[PDB]
Amino acid sequence: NPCACFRNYVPVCGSDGKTYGNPCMLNCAAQTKVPGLKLVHEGRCQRSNVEQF
């Protein structure tokens, strides 16, 4: 199961511009929510005053 994930926070940024809580969760989304979703970089997606402070 791609969506069998723990919630441990290992933030990664998807090609959809959405942060995923960990790579497992990105994969879950890749398999069920966002076709073609890829992990583009480690850490949260960059969005000032939203994802960062």
Side-chain angles (χ1 to χ4, degrees):
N1 190 349
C3 297
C5 301
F6 287 117
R7 295 182 186 101
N8 301 48
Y9 183 60
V10 180
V12 295
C13 179
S15 54
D16 57 356
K18 181 170 183 170
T19 299
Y20 290 88
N22 55 47
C24 183
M25 297 280 200
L26 183 147
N27 184 63
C28 167
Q31 299 327 129
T32 62
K33 275 181 183 172
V34 184
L37 180 62
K38 300 291 201 174
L39 197 171
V40 303
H41 66 75
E42 197 70 17
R44 306 199 65 90
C45 296
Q46 290 286 134
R47 190 173 172 94
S48 62
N49 305 108
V50 175
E51 305 268 346
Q52 293 71 47
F53 344 126

